[PDB]
């Protein structure tokens, strides 16, 4: 619930996403569901052009399961509210 | 909500779990990653032979092996671009 | 809708394609929720095309199923 | 319930506990909960010899944690 | 009764090395922890190492990439193992 | 029924092989709802390199996400 | 749920796993949770090299459990 929470309040900005396979696509989350899935507008490449899989698509939407790296600007989090929230959930999941 | 009701009946490009690109049409979609498509071609294959690159229609693709699905474009029906054969496979899901 | 199309795919043939590279062409006669199948009358073959044996039925579990090739009909 | 007791009767006392991938982690089982996550410290790590020395508390999943035994 | 993941939120904003799949690891202050080992780290150094290997003699050597990045959260499915440094 | 012979089989000899080329045969000391089941001095055994690994003699859990197959008596 | 296991009650059948490893043998027994017990098991390995002569790398079991979570196919032998 609280990584639901930390994608659906990071909606609106761009943001880097890294799938499992090395491929890295960067664009602005548009929407975000509970098993962490990612949809990203406006996406492109990452510096490296190796990968001209689709090249024309402008809305992609990655599944939580293959995402491994989500890169992110550290003007759009706070440290002190994601680390309450994560001391409450590390005491709410084990009780 | 991050729903796949916007990329149906409309061309799109699923990344399977071993590293290949599918290029097709949703027919049906569902809570689990696992979907229906119609029209389905590689996009590997077409800069050598174009009729070995449509391999079947109709096929379901589990969720297990679904990574990511972009939406592409699409003008109008039977139109397709940017495919080549020159660039670095993809890898793997797992690693 | 991918398990009402494979629930209404009774009697029709397709071809079960596992994640471990393993390919069973047959005709699926029971469907489940969780993605289960049980088909009749299934051949199995591997990737390279080495067929192993032949069984007149087969059941294949959701998970292990990688893809499902079903005609155009 | 034996699980449980198992587990309750494991405390303090030195286990290793080997991974999915192969590799051991050796030292003090300083906690443990019943989803088979691992907390040791001073856990030495040997998957071809020795790979890395633990000066404090190293957690292991208990997703990707294969068996655990405790050291006599 | 102290939990693993009770014990791992107590190092809550220090710094920490996160051993993961594929021969990698990472170095930051972890701000954000779940029960599912998902970390959302600030100011994280990721660490990629490969072995190369010899045509001739066959022997391995050792090379390591860094990357820096100011916020990055991984899912606990690739992190094998955490410690502090 | 197998929930019944595994509960049979607690205070014998038993040898629990994974997916992988490893098994570990001891003395069933006890199972939950759950696969993951209590060892006594459960030595680990590698098929492929056909070798003993470790030789310990201990309460061991095993974790049964991925407990292949399990035989009561041991080997043979 | 969709296969009953009542007509393999007294037959031989062979289970394939998803680790690769496969068993055959005359099942003794069966749950609703797709967990099999089963006599006179015979496992056979999956290996690069063996791929039409799986009869090498075979060991016996006897009385074995297999359990439903690591099921992947079943057939009748």
Redesign the interface.
Known sequence: MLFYSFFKSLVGKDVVVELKNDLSICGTLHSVDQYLNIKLTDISVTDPEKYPHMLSVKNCFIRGSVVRYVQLPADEVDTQLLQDAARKEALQQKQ | TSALENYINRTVAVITSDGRMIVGTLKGFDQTINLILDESHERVFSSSQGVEQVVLGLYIVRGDNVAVIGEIDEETDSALDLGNIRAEPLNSVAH | LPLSLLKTAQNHPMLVELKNGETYNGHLVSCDNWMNINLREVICTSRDGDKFWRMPECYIRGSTIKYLRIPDE | QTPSDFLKQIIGRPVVVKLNSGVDYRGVLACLDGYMNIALEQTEEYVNGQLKNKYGDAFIRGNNVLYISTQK | VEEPLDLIRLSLDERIYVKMRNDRELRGRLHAYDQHLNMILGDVEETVTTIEIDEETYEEIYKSTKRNIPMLFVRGDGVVLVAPP | LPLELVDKCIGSRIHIVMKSDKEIVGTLLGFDDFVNMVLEDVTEFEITPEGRRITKLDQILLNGNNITMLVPGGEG | ???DLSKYIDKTIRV??????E?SGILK?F?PLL???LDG?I?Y?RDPDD??KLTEDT?????????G????????Q
């Open positions: 749920s969709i296969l394939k796993f998803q680790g690769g490893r068993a027994g749950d967990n099999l017990v098991t496992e390995m791929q039409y060991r016996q079991l006897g009385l074995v459990v297999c359990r979570t690591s099921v992947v196919l079943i057939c009748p």
